[PDB]
Amino acid sequence: VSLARRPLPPLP
Amino acid sequence: GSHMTFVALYDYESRTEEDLSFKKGERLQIVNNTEGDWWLAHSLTTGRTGYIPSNYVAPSD
Numbered sequence: 001v002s003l004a005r006r007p008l009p010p011l012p
Numbered sequence: 013g014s015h016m017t018f019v020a021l022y023d024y025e026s027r028t029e030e031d032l033s034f035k036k037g038e039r040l041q042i043v044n045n046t047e048g049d050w051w052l053a054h055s056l057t058t059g060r061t062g063y064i065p066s067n068y069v070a071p072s073d
Contacts, residue, residue, distance in 0.1 A: 003030050
C-alpha cells in the first residue's frame with residue numbers, strides 16, 4: 001500500500 | 013531522470029523506518045513526487061533514501 005498517501009505533518 | 017534538487021526548510025525527525033530524518037538546508041534528490049504528498053527522496057548528504065513530507069522542502073536549483 002502507498003507510503004506517499006499520508007497526511008502532511010505540521011510545520012514546526 | 014531529472015537532476016533537480018530540493019532543500020529542507022526545517023529540521024524533521026522521522027517517526028518510522030520508511031521516512032528520512034533531515035536537517036534544514038539538507039539537499040534532497042526526489043525520486044518521485046507524483047503519488048501523494050510524501051515524496052520519495054535521496055539525501056545528498058547521508059546517502060539514505062526514504063519518504064519526506066513535501067511541505068518541508070522547496071526547489072533549490
